[PDB]
Design a protein around this ligand. Structure first.
Ligand SMILES: Nc1nc2c(ncn2[C@@H]2O[C@H](COP(=O)(O)OP(=O)(O)NP(=O)(O)O)[C@@H](O)[C@H]2O)c(=O)[nH]1
Ligand SMILES: Nc1nc2c(ncn2[C@@H]2O[C@H](COP(=O)(O)OP(=O)(O)NP(=O)(O)O)[C@@H](O)[C@H]2O)c(=O)[nH]1
Lengths: 178, 417
RNA sequence: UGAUAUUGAAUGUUGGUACAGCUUGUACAGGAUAGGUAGGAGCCUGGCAUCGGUGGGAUACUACCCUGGCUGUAUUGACCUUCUAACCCGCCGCCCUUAUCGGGCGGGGAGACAGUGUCAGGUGGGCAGU
């Protein structure tokens, strides 16, 4: 019945366990025009990112930490197989091709789309930062200390609010479930 | 024949694409409510010389349930359901709600993306793979881009008289038509203005085919200062030009309104057969000499049209509904009839002999020119001597010599030549 | 005909709105045809439990908002049936006063109605401008 505080719930989701502390947030479609879906680099923070870099952009992609780049087309290797691993990003030139030729990213949630900051010319800066109207966000672990998830939820809430959606009218906040 | 239907949330330019498929049928406006209330029918072809098109209204969560029912019904007959969605705004929750029905529909579905009017931002065809359907396509009604590929995508799955109906709003026209072909085809609502444009359907009656069109009613010109929603009245006026039999509908509960006489003027001035019809007898009393109360009153007020037969039927209780067509078929012949040149002339000087009061106007010849309506030309020494009182006199004699019931007549006058 | 103000009380019916607390959402498959939407750190209190599973969704339990319903809380509305205190009397008595004007003070009758000020159709050659 009682709404706890942020400084109490970080110390208490220690006790709700090495598990991962995640946050649900009910948003306030009618408002799809100014919907609230997104990604931001995190403060208090293993992935396997595979890139679709084209041209010279593969040359800076092999030194940042990526596992496999490609031979400029391995969607034929994606056809009839392809246990995908963690994250798929791309570049704004072969995205159209990979989109049409690739026919295995819709119900699997890895389709490159430049609304998320994942399809850009800065592939070296993109590898290094990734490593019904609702958003899910993993802010961290059980084993993090009490001062880590406070900045994590603060950064994510400031990101949500920084993004005060248009048609701001009416309540924006409905529920925080830590 | 193949059937193709278009569905989606409103304001996606579905009717715009439907129209540039062929001609310009559905009204195109920009607003959330201004969608086609019901389903329409048409024909199409791309190297197959055989296809049909169906357009419906937008689907969301006023009246929307009936539109949803119509959209569901259209999803049945359609072979491929072109599912068009906006491109500039990405995707929406209502888009997923629409996609739910298609997911539960076991028919091939082609996905199309509108609002792609130029080459560069045409490359925005992405993230629609999450919908679970095949390759999307670009289209723009403003410029007609990407039409060939979309029609090829539709093709890869490839396997009579007209009579109208008009009147002032809320007199049961839609109820009357859907209570006559036997099948829910057009919407019925308590508020005036339920229909938004012409609805066309074909059917066979007594081994004879027929075409019936609704016109959403007509209100006064002075007080029609709406927000371009009265642009549909132009569509209603168009149907009269393509129709050849006009049914005017009056309410029996309410008395004769001044606007009804004006509406009947448009049909008469168009040279079309008219059959005056009254509906909703369930309201007012049905008794002896209540037949003549409105039967006589109509004649007193509607003098300019006297040839029109008068029919009484109530669509709600379906009383004497089957008697409407017997009137229609009879009116069909009289609007297209010719009389012999010999006989017609022999009747003319009999009339002028008993009325030798035409210097004096001279009658020399008379004959017919057109079948519909029957035009006649009389050769006189001078058409200036012709008087509108005398011109009307000739019409009555002709209308009495033969039947010529339920159709207007026009008389032309030519000089001595 | 409709709103809105002039414009009140009582009980009876009585919805809507808002805030709450409990319930429903029928997926081939799937643990009873017992929801989407963030999932994966428990029994032995009669029973039997615990991975995981053709599954797009099983939870060896962490962990939000919806949709239709049920119970409270407040808001108001819609009404009926009453009453009375505005508002209305071309009803009676008394005084202004000698007065079928008018105004006061008493009874009676109607009473939240009618009447009045700002917003829709028809009506109807009602009367104008052409
Ligand atoms: N810029 C642009 N606007 C378009 C295009 N196609 C349609 N529109 C706009 O979209 C508006 C709505 O389209 P319309 O066909 O009337 O859609 P509708 O009547 O709501 N039918 P539905 O609800 O079934 O989609 C049009 O008035 C027009 O301004 C296009 O290719 N480009
Ligand atoms: N008493 C009575 N009511 C009727 C009859 N037919 C229809 N109604 C009712 O009166 C209204 C007329 O509906 P509708 O057919 O849409 O009339 P319309 O608006 O003139 N036609 P449209 O919808 O095409 O504009 C509806 O509320 C309907 O239920 C009838 O024969 N008798």
């Amino acid at each position: 019945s009682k709404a706890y505080d942020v400084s109490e719930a970080v110390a208490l989701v220690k006790k709700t366990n090495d598990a991962t502390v995640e946050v649900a947030f009910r948003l306030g479609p009618r408002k799809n025009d100014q919907q609230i879906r997104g990604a931001v680099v995190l403060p208090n923070g293993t992935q396997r990112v595979l890139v679709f870099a084209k041209g010279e952009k593969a040359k800076e992609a092999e030194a940042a930490g990526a596992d496999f780049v490609g031979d400029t087309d391995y969607i034929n290797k994606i056809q009839q197989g392809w246990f995908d691993f963690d994250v798929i990003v791309a570049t704004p030139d072969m995205m159209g091709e990979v989109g049409k030729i690739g026919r295995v990213l819709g119900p699997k949630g890895l389709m490159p789309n430049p609304k998320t900051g994942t399809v850009t010319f800065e592939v070296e800066k993109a590898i290094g930062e990734i490593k019904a109207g609702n958003i899910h966000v993993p802010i961290g672990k059980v084993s993090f200390e009490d001062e880590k998830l406070v900045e994590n939820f603060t950064t994510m809430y400031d990101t949500i609010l920084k993004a005060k959606p248009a048609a701001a009218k009416g309540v924006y906040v409905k529920n925080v479930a830590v | 024949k193949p059937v193709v239907a278009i569905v989606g949330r409103p304001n996606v330019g579905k009717s715009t694409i439907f129209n540039r498929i062929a001609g310009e049928r559905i009204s195109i406006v920009e607003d959330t409510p201004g969608v086609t209330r019901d389903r329409i029918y048409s024909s199409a072809e791309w190297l197959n010389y055989d296809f049909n098109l169906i357009d419906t209204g937008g689907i969301d969560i006023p009246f929307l349930a009936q539109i949803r029912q119509q959209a569901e019904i259209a999803m049945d007959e359609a072979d491929v359901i072109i599912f068009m969605v906006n491109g500039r705004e990405g995707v929406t929750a209502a888009d997923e709600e629409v996609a739910k029905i298609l997911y539960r529909t076991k028919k091939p579905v082609v996905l199309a993306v509108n609002k792609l009017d130029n080459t560069e931002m045409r490359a925005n065809i992405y993230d629609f793979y999450s919908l679970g359907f095949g390759e999307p396509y670009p289209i723009s009604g403003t410029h007609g881009l990407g039409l060939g590929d979309l029609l090829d995508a539709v093709a890869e799955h490839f396997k009579v008289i007209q009579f109208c109906l008009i009147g002032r709003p809320n007199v049961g026209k839609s109820s009357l038509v859907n209570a006559m072909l036997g099948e829910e085809r057009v919407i019925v609502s308590n508020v005036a203005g339920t229909t938004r444009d012409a609805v066309d359907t074909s059917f066979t009656y007594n081994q004879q085919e027929f075409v019936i069109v609704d016109t959403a009613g007509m209100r006064k010109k002075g007080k029609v200062y709406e927000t371009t929603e009265k642009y549909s009245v132009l569509r209603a006026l168009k149907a009269i030009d393509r129709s050849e039999v006009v049914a005017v509908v009056l309410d029996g509960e309410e008395g004769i309104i001044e606007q009804d006489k004006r509406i009947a003027g448009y049909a008469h001035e168009a040279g079309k057969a008219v059959v005056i019809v009254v509906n909703k007898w369930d309201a007012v009393d049905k008794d002896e000499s209540t037949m003549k109360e409105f039967e006589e009153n109509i004649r007193d007020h509607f003098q300019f049209l006297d040839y029109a037969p008068i029919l009484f039927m109530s669509a709600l209780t379906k009383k004497r509904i089957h008697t409407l067509m017997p009137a229609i078929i009879k009116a069909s012949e009289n609007h297209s009839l010719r009389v012999q040149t010999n006989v017609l002339n022999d009747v003319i000087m009999d009339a002028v002999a008993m009325n030798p009061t035409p210097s004096r106007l001279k009658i020399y010849y008379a004959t017919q020119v057109s079948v519909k309506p029957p035009s006649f030309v009389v050769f006189v020494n001078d058409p200036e001597l012709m008087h509108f009182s005398y011109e009307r006199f000739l019409e009555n004699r002709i209308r009495d010599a033969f039947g010529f019931e339920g159709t207007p007549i026009k008389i032309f006058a030519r000089a001595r030549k």
